Structure 1
């Protein structure tokens, strides 16, 4: 039969991160549960997230999720029954090129806030007398682009600290390489340690294909018969919002066509201003689904 269908080798939603900008924040900064702003559809970050800089290009980041389990058997069983798992530590190591405030703070485990540059620029980076176990907020967001709607993926973690610093070579063939591995810890005020998040306008196109939620099969414009005043009044302009069967907005991607531009014209932004009093029909399609809406315009 059609074994390719049951294979389900889509080979289209396999996103590959490109810009692994590792955001660092102090412990005082409140961690954010999402990397997307629920007001427009773009990316927003709370204040305090400062990028580490540029990471290794030829090698890149090597994230490792070590698993440690245990077997229990005391009554003569050929196989381990109830195989429990104890440790699920996640470690990742990335190289560094630039020497800025956050990088030195992370590599020396200090708070270089009271330090001040001298009158001639002379500075000293002091190792602590007692090594403080300062915790940091780490954000590991990747990038993938599909036309004008990219794919945003990130490795959310609200607690991380130094685990081991590898030996660095500062010879005359490469720049100084700071590649310390960090083991992710578990936070208490939020209840999660490592989180995988997908965002971006492009992810909306393939969220149904990925199997999350339900498939997009129905759509309807929420304003049934909106009324807009011809004059520049309070209700002169109106905003449309089409809702699908998956409970996700489809405004920024689905375009709206006004069959009667004389009465009211709707652009891609979904604005409903109205040119002349009357009734108009608006059709919204993206690539396969057609939805019809009726807009009434009066003075």
Structure 2
């Protein structure tokens, strides 16, 4: 065995967040559990999460993790017999550009929902008497677009608080930047402080390679031998679902073909409509893996 086989390097698993956005929601909003829609796996932001818009490219977004642990030392032991990690402090910071309501609320620790614009649109936002402890739910979601198969990777922080505010420098040749450092706290209802997740059509290809689940070996068409009506109606169409050995829906990834197009009409998605009564064979093929089903059309 040579060195390269042992190394087993997969350049595809390296994910570059080509686009990124941060969505903040008030603490009353139900925290998000996953960003994948149950319908078709598309990106689905839960209601109440509103983005903070553009932020500075050069600084980007910085995530920091810090451990605070106490080690128990016994006599004669060079290394501790037991170490106690109290917490894992997670923070993240960025540099927003936009002077919208939520950004100013975040930086001023105040609720400006009651602020009403004056007769000419002018507003005045007063800093509170003492800073308030306001908690938000944060979704940091980024898209890596490769071969038109995006990978959406996101950080879910169900409870964050404004921990630090950097210095604000005003220049005549630059826009105003707000640079807060937000600390993520533990949330009891969901049981985690920060969660990292992946989703998207691009990630579905790399699920097996990354080591989550089992490698795809066989393809199976879940609807077996369906009967479709020639006449128009609610039961005139039947939707096919293709699955794998590891339990992942591979329908968007497979290619649908019909042996007899007139008897049954199949699309790329997998819908089956029986134009003419008879027997047809619908085959879903992805790579070298093939699944076949038979459709009977009765008028």
> Structure 2 length as normaliser, TM-score?
0.97
Q: Which runs of 5+ in 1 are unaligned?
A: none
Partner deviation per Cα, 1:247-287 (whole Å, 9 max, x = no partner): 11111221111111131121111111112111111211111
Partner deviation per Cα, 1:99-120 (whole Å, 9 max, x = no partner): 1100000000000122111112
Report if aligned partners of 1:229, 1:274 keep a CA contact under 8 Å in 2: yes
Partner deviation per Cα, 1:213-272 (whole Å, 9 max, x = no partner): 000001110111000011113321100001111111111221111111131121111111
More strand by share: 2
Report if aligned partners of 2:163, 2:182 keep a CA contact under 8 Å in 1: yes
Partner deviation per Cα, 1:145-193 (whole Å, 9 max, x = no partner): 1223210100001000111111111022422221111111111111111
Q: 1:75 to 1:283 in 2, by over 3 A?
A: same
Q: Which runs of 5+ in 2 are unaligned?
A: none
Instruction: Say which SS state the counterpart of residue 243 (structure 1) adopts.
Output: strand
Displacement of 1:66? 1.1
Determine the C-alpha separation between the residues in 2 that align with 1:40 and 1:12: 23
Instruction: Say which SS state the counterpart of residue 142 (structure 1) adopts.
Output: strand
Determine the C-alpha separation between the residues in 2 that align with 1:292 and 1:25: 46
Determine the C-alpha separation between the residues in 2 that align with 1:109 and 1:230: 63
Partner deviation per Cα, 1:125-148 (whole Å, 9 max, x = no partner): 111112110101111001101223
Determine the C-alpha separation between the residues in 1 that align with 2:173 and 2:63: 26
Displacement of 1:6? 1.6
**Worse overlay, 165-174 or 45-54:** 165-174
In structure 2, the residue matched to 1:244 is: 244
Instruction: Say which SS state the counterpart of residue 66 (structure 1) adopts.
Output: strand
Displacement of 1:123? 1.6
Report if aligned partners of 2:18, 2:145 keep a CA contact under 8 Å in 1: no
Determine the C-alpha separation between the residues in 1 that align with 2:118 and 2:229: 66
Determine the C-alpha separation between the residues in 2 that align with 1:5 and 1:257: 37
Determine the C-alpha separation between the residues in 1 that align with 2:112 and 2:98: 17
Q: 1:233 to 1:172 in 2, by over 3 A?
A: closer
In structure 2, the residue matched to 1:292 is: 292
What count of residue pairs does the alignment treat as equivalent?
A: 299
Determine the C-alpha separation between the residues in 1 that align with 2:282 and 2:103: 54
Determine the C-alpha separation between the residues in 1 that align with 2:233 and 2:176: 64
Displacement of 1:43? 1.2
Report if aligned partners of 1:255, 1:267 keep a CA contact under 8 Å in 2: no
Structure 1 runs (4+) greater than 3 angstroms displaced:
none
**Worse overlay, 112-121 or 191-200:** 112-121
> Structure 1 length as normaliser, TM-score?
0.97
Report if aligned partners of 2:116, 2:123 keep a CA contact under 8 Å in 1: yes
Q: CA RMSD in A?
A: 1.2
Report if aligned partners of 1:63, 1:90 keep a CA contact under 8 Å in 2: yes
